[PDB]
Design an enzyme around this catalytic site. Sequence first.
Site, mmCIF file in Angstrom:
data_model
loop_
_atom_site.group_PDB
_atom_site.id
_atom_site.type_symbol
_atom_site.label_atom_id
_atom_site.label_comp_id
_atom_site.label_asym_id
_atom_site.label_seq_id
_atom_site.Cartn_x
_atom_site.Cartn_y
_atom_site.Cartn_z
ATOM 1 N N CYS A 67 0.826 -1.194 0.000
ATOM 2 C CA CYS A 67 0.000 0.000 0.000
ATOM 3 C C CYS A 67 0.875 1.265 0.000
ATOM 4 N N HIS A 68 0.278 2.389 -0.392
ATOM 5 C CA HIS A 68 0.959 3.684 -0.473
ATOM 6 C C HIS A 68 1.888 4.027 0.702
ATOM 7 N N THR A 69 1.440 3.784 1.932
ATOM 8 C CA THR A 69 2.230 4.185 3.109
ATOM 9 C C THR A 69 3.494 3.341 3.321
ATOM 10 N N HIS A 82 1.576 -4.052 6.101
ATOM 11 C CA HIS A 82 0.489 -3.914 7.074
ATOM 12 C C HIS A 82 -0.873 -4.387 6.537
ATOM 13 N N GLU A 83 -0.858 -4.968 5.338
ATOM 14 C CA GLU A 83 -2.043 -5.564 4.721
ATOM 15 C C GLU A 83 -1.795 -7.051 4.550
ATOM 16 N N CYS A 112 -7.821 -3.162 22.467
ATOM 17 C CA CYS A 112 -7.605 -3.730 23.809
ATOM 18 C C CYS A 112 -8.929 -3.961 24.548
ATOM 19 N N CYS A 160 -9.394 0.474 27.253
ATOM 20 C CA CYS A 160 -9.009 1.885 27.369
ATOM 21 C C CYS A 160 -10.201 2.802 27.087
ATOM 22 N N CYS A 205 -11.374 2.482 23.414
ATOM 23 C CA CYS A 205 -12.119 1.247 23.120
ATOM 24 C C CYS A 205 -13.511 1.244 23.747
ATOM 25 N N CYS A 264 -7.805 2.830 19.720
ATOM 26 C CA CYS A 264 -7.177 2.202 20.896
ATOM 27 C C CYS A 264 -5.778 2.765 21.149
ATOM 28 N N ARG A 299 0.191 2.307 21.321
ATOM 29 C CA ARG A 299 0.549 3.271 20.269
ATOM 30 C C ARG A 299 1.983 3.807 20.323
ATOM 31 N N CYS A 347 -6.439 -3.249 5.365
ATOM 32 C CA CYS A 347 -6.285 -1.794 5.237
ATOM 33 C C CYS A 347 -7.265 -1.083 4.295
ATOM 34 N N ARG A 399 -4.446 -3.053 -6.190
ATOM 35 C CA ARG A 399 -3.698 -3.825 -5.200
ATOM 36 C C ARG A 399 -2.984 -5.013 -5.840
HETATM 37 N N1 NAD Z 1 -7.297 7.105 6.867
HETATM 38 C C1 NAD Z 1 -6.923 5.824 6.777
HETATM 39 O O1 NAD Z 1 -7.149 4.904 7.809
HETATM 40 C C2 NAD Z 1 -6.237 5.332 5.539
HETATM 41 C C3 NAD Z 1 -6.151 3.963 5.279
HETATM 42 C C4 NAD Z 1 -5.617 3.534 4.067
HETATM 43 C C5 NAD Z 1 -5.163 4.470 3.146
HETATM 44 N N2 NAD Z 1 -5.238 5.813 3.421
HETATM 45 C C6 NAD Z 1 -4.772 6.835 2.470
HETATM 46 O O2 NAD Z 1 -5.658 6.943 1.379
HETATM 47 C C7 NAD Z 1 -4.981 7.489 0.265
HETATM 48 C C8 NAD Z 1 -5.329 6.679 -0.989
HETATM 49 O O3 NAD Z 1 -4.851 5.352 -0.911
HETATM 50 P P1 NAD Z 1 -4.866 4.398 -2.214
HETATM 51 O O4 NAD Z 1 -4.294 3.104 -1.797
HETATM 52 O O5 NAD Z 1 -6.215 4.450 -2.822
HETATM 53 O O6 NAD Z 1 -3.828 5.218 -3.138
HETATM 54 P P2 NAD Z 1 -3.715 5.218 -4.745
HETATM 55 O O7 NAD Z 1 -2.424 5.852 -5.095
HETATM 56 O O8 NAD Z 1 -3.842 3.868 -5.346
HETATM 57 O O9 NAD Z 1 -4.905 6.155 -5.274
HETATM 58 C C9 NAD Z 1 -4.811 7.564 -5.240
HETATM 59 C C10 NAD Z 1 -5.478 8.107 -6.500
HETATM 60 O O10 NAD Z 1 -5.574 9.513 -6.431
HETATM 61 C C11 NAD Z 1 -5.404 10.029 -7.734
HETATM 62 N N3 NAD Z 1 -5.028 11.445 -7.659
HETATM 63 C C12 NAD Z 1 -3.800 11.980 -7.367
HETATM 64 N N4 NAD Z 1 -3.904 13.328 -7.400
HETATM 65 C C13 NAD Z 1 -5.182 13.656 -7.696
HETATM 66 C C14 NAD Z 1 -5.823 14.875 -7.847
HETATM 67 N N5 NAD Z 1 -5.118 16.007 -7.805
HETATM 68 N N6 NAD Z 1 -7.168 14.897 -8.164
HETATM 69 C C15 NAD Z 1 -7.877 13.715 -8.323
HETATM 70 N N7 NAD Z 1 -7.230 12.504 -8.171
HETATM 71 C C16 NAD Z 1 -5.903 12.478 -7.865
HETATM 72 C C17 NAD Z 1 -4.352 9.137 -8.382
HETATM 73 O O11 NAD Z 1 -4.410 9.185 -9.797
HETATM 74 C C18 NAD Z 1 -4.693 7.783 -7.771
HETATM 75 O O12 NAD Z 1 -5.527 7.002 -8.599
HETATM 76 C C19 NAD Z 1 -3.500 7.501 0.622
HETATM 77 O O13 NAD Z 1 -3.162 8.810 1.018
HETATM 78 C C20 NAD Z 1 -3.414 6.579 1.822
HETATM 79 O O14 NAD Z 1 -2.331 6.902 2.665
HETATM 80 C C21 NAD Z 1 -5.774 6.248 4.601
HETATM 81 C C1 022 Z 2 -2.951 3.848 12.942
HETATM 82 C C2 022 Z 2 -1.641 4.569 12.840
HETATM 83 C C3 022 Z 2 -0.494 3.809 13.004
HETATM 84 C C4 022 Z 2 0.756 4.398 12.925
HETATM 85 C C5 022 Z 2 1.953 3.501 13.115
HETATM 86 N N1 022 Z 2 3.151 3.857 12.652
HETATM 87 O O1 022 Z 2 1.787 2.439 13.698
HETATM 88 C C6 022 Z 2 0.838 5.774 12.679
HETATM 89 C C7 022 Z 2 -0.335 6.534 12.512
HETATM 90 C C8 022 Z 2 -1.611 5.945 12.598
HETATM 91 N N2 022 Z 2 -2.746 6.655 12.442
HETATM 92 C C9 022 Z 2 -3.297 7.325 13.464
HETATM 93 C C10 022 Z 2 -2.774 7.495 14.868
HETATM 94 C C11 022 Z 2 -3.438 6.430 15.727
HETATM 95 C C12 022 Z 2 -3.287 6.747 17.194
HETATM 96 O O2 022 Z 2 -2.599 7.738 17.538
HETATM 97 O O3 022 Z 2 -3.864 5.989 18.005
HETATM 98 C C13 022 Z 2 -4.474 7.873 12.966
HETATM 99 C C14 022 Z 2 -4.599 7.490 11.645
HETATM 100 C C15 022 Z 2 -3.498 6.702 11.335
HETATM 101 C C16 022 Z 2 -3.231 6.068 10.019
HETATM 102 C C17 022 Z 2 -2.049 6.324 9.333
HETATM 103 C C18 022 Z 2 -1.826 5.714 8.098
HETATM 104 C C19 022 Z 2 -2.756 4.848 7.501
HETATM 105 N N3 022 Z 2 -2.549 4.269 6.315
HETATM 106 C C20 022 Z 2 -2.259 4.961 5.224
HETATM 107 C C21 022 Z 2 -2.142 3.988 4.258
HETATM 108 N N4 022 Z 2 -2.383 2.780 4.831
HETATM 109 C C22 022 Z 2 -2.644 2.956 6.146
HETATM 110 C C23 022 Z 2 -3.928 4.626 8.229
HETATM 111 C C24 022 Z 2 -4.180 5.217 9.465
HETATM 112 ZN ZN ZN Z 3 -7.926 0.115 23.704
HETATM 113 ZN ZN ZN Z 4 -2.462 0.896 4.025
#
Ligand code: NAD
Ligand code: 022
Ligand code: ZN
Ligand code: ZN
Lengths: 372, 373
Positions: A43-45, A65-66, A95, A98, A101, A109, A113, A172, A367
């Site tokens: 995944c991206h991260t 992480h996936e 957990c 907390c 949770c 949770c 962390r 994820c 993916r």
């Molecule tokens: N909040 C969470 O718990 C959590 C969990 C997983 C992923 N994420 C985040 O979600 C985001 C997306 O993840 P993904 O796996 O789908 O990534 P991905 O790279 O596969 O998809 C991102 C898409 O955005 C498009 N894009 C880029 N710039 C753009 C713009 N200016 N306007 C419109 N579209 C644009 C790209 O073409 C791409 O298709 C990442 O930032 C990731 O870190 C967050």
């Molecule tokens: C859930 C998480 C884990 C980590 C880490 N390094 O373990 C860092 C930031 C986050 N994180 C937090 C903080 C959680 C907290 O403070 O309890 C809020 C949101 C996130 C988070 C960060 C990144 C992603 N992410 C992006 C792409 N794939 C997963 C998903 C969630």
């Molecule tokens: Zn907890």
């Molecule tokens: Zn992810």
Amino acid sequence: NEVIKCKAAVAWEAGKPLSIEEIEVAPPKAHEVRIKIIATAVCHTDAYTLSGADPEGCFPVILGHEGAGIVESVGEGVTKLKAGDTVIPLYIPQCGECKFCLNPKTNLCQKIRVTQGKGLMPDGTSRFTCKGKTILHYMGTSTFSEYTVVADISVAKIDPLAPLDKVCLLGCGISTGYGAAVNTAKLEPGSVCAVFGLGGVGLAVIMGCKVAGASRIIGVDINKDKFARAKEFGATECINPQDFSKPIQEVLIEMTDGGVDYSFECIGNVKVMRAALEACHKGWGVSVVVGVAASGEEIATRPFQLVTGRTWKGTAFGGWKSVESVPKLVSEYMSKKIKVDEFVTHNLSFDEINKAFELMHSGKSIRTVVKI
Amino acid sequence: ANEVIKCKAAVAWEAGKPLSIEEIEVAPPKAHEVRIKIIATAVCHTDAYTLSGADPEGCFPVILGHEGAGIVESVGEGVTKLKAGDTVIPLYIPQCGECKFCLNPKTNLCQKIRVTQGKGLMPDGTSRFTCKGKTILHYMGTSTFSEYTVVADISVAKIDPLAPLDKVCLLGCGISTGYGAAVNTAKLEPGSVCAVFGLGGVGLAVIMGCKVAGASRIIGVDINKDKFARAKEFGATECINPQDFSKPIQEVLIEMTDGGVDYSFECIGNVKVMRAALEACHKGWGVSVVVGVAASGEEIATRPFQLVTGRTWKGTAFGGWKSVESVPKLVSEYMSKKIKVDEFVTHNLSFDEINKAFELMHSGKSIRTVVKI
Ligand SMILES: NC(=O)c1ccc[n+]([C@@H]2O[C@H](COP(=O)([O-])OP(=O)(O)OC[C@H]3O[C@@H](n4cnc5c(N)ncnc54)[C@H](O)[C@@H]3O)[C@@H](O)[C@H]2O)c1
Ligand SMILES: Cc1cc(C(N)=O)ccc1-n1c(CCC(=O)O)ccc1-c1ccc(-n2ccnc2)cc1
Ligand SMILES: [Zn+2]
Ligand SMILES: [Zn+2]
Ligand SMILES: NC(=O)c1ccc[n+]([C@@H]2O[C@H](COP(=O)([O-])OP(=O)(O)OC[C@H]3O[C@@H](n4cnc5c(N)ncnc54)[C@H](O)[C@@H]3O)[C@@H](O)[C@H]2O)c1
Ligand SMILES: Cc1cc(C(N)=O)ccc1-n1c(CCC(=O)O)ccc1-c1ccc(-n2ccnc2)cc1
Ligand SMILES: [K+]
Ligand SMILES: [K+]
Ligand SMILES: [Zn+2]
Ligand SMILES: [Zn+2]
């Protein structure tokens, strides 16, 4: 339990390909679980941390992480899990004790962390060694290894019939996008929606919007190659911001007679986050930030946007309380309520793991599932 | 209706100047308009904002004022639900009951007359006010700084005829807004921990709302410690001054609440404080409501991590009340002593002293000054 010698993809330093190494995995200590990883995705991260742009990214580290797999063994005090259990490791634990949770409004949770952020088990040490060096954990999961060790609260026990080369994606992206729609937004039937970014996260949002009975689902991406699959998932139309001279929020307001009921930013671009909020309808519009922006970057808007009735929120792992929810999500997939298979665009063996990173960078994947 | 009325009004001839008590003429109401004899009016921050010249939407000459209470003098053609003698509060947020917004329970922002209202005109695109041969504009659909005003029939709440108008005029803006921000926009649960930034009338009404909803803690925040005593009277459990601390106010509040508040309310109009109010909210479930109206062009900012880790940013307009149906209910809550109104009145003046109300407002010495017409 004994030390396991096995294969892992080690990131020794930033900006370099992963190294397939022979590592040692320590047996689980009290309240830890050692998992045989059967499949993992990239995944991206994972890529972001590997690049070295991550301010809290440390090396050497086992990323990933996936994942999905099978409990190899459990540490002292572990009674709810046992060798043989089918599992998904969790970067957001539960957990169950907390204040987070215990609160129905959050899934964040806090029990482990601090150690997790430092790439460590709850006791402040790592279970990974390679060539005489300690190797750090990542996101509490470290799925880029034949065997990983996780805290016992970082484990979802799932349907033993689940295909692990598919359900690893519920670790994820899919869970996050789906939950953003049904937990965070909780959108009502007939809702008009916009989804910014049509990767796996965006597609899962669309999927959630459709499950919830959304009337109109507008996909937004600068890559038009993403449009076909978005429509298959249920986008009623797709637009490319590059095709318009006006800012994307103005285009969306025009298209929808005032703006969308719900928007989702699934990119991690702060300018687009602002656009997604401003694309929401006056009075009741809600924008959910799913994308994770680079550190230091700020989102902005004029407070008039909120005073006139728009709401700005965000989500972490789709708001799912992870240990109780992930098994239910697996069950929804098994019962064909949600899609998982449709997110898999490529398949690779473990030794080929670097090609999954190449596919991501090219924009050609949703993916890639790596078979261990 | 009947005839042209010759009366007094406080005219704002030009930006940056005081109000002038002038002899004006008020035209009779046209179709679906209502002429109201104003009995009492108060002065609110946004009146001064427009008066100052800083408002890019401000136009002169104009009759200001939007917190008022009065008696219907006459009604235009087609008006049936209101008649001469009805006790009323004019509304800057109308309720036509028929538009997209009125029909949606999530909002109170009726759009029926907003374009003409923004221009200082009645819905037919003309003004009912003249002075010395010149057209004088309406303001916020209400123009309460006049012996008589004309409003659209959708801009009127009919209220309990026993309500004292020298008190309930305040339900035309500040009290209703603050109270509604708590009970409508936030909808805080019993036991909630709350912070209120700004302890003027709006902030005090937020405190009042938090107490009605059964908050366990209500932390008042103001750089003016003179505001603390009345805040505590309204139900603040403690009061803090940002100037007494070396660190950012959000860090202070996080420290005193073991992670941050459940609900915060910005009641100032300061974009830095708005960010602080959001960041002072608890991880996972905190909600910040922007009530203050910032100067045009100013932006709020934060890091998106704040939302991803579970905080929610909202705002409110007139406390989210669908105005025509809600304001009479708010008057009834006052009459039954469920809410306070009298406690917001700190000063009383005559119409010819209206400029002193502005002086008191800017000196920080008042909450609300009621002007007796
Ligand atoms: N909040 C969470 O718990 C959590 C969990 C997983 C992923 N994420 C985040 O979600 C985001 C997306 O993840 P993904 O796996 O789908 O990534 P991905 O790279 O596969 O998809 C991102 C898409 O955005 C498009 N894009 C880029 N710039 C753009 C713009 N200016 N306007 C419109 N579209 C644009 C790209 O073409 C791409 O298709 C990442 O930032 C990731 O870190 C967050
Ligand atoms: C859930 C998480 C884990 C980590 C880490 N390094 O373990 C860092 C930031 C986050 N994180 C937090 C903080 C959680 C907290 O403070 O309890 C809020 C949101 C996130 C988070 C960060 C990144 C992603 N992410 C992006 C792409 N794939 C997963 C998903 C969630
Ligand atoms: Zn907890
Ligand atoms: Zn992810
Ligand atoms: N959203 C709406 O529908 C609506 C309705 C009515 C009023 N308002 C707005 O609410 C705001 C407050 O109205 P009011 O009548 O209570 O005004 P007020 O001036 O009487 O109160 C503001 C208070 O904020 C305090 N303050 C100023 N800077 C501060 C800071 N840095 N930190 C802490 N406190 C600070 C002042 O001491 C003052 O007591 C105004 O902006 C007004 O326009 C909005
Ligand atoms: C209600 C209002 C009236 C006027 C006006 N001049 O008539 C301008 C803006 C607003 N306004 C709108 C209109 C946006 C829309 O409906 O599209 C949303 C929110 C407000 C609004 C503006 C100012 C105040 N306010 C501040 C202090 N006292 C009242 C309260 C609400
Ligand atoms: K909802
Ligand atoms: K609530
Ligand atoms: Zn309406
Ligand atoms: Zn006001």
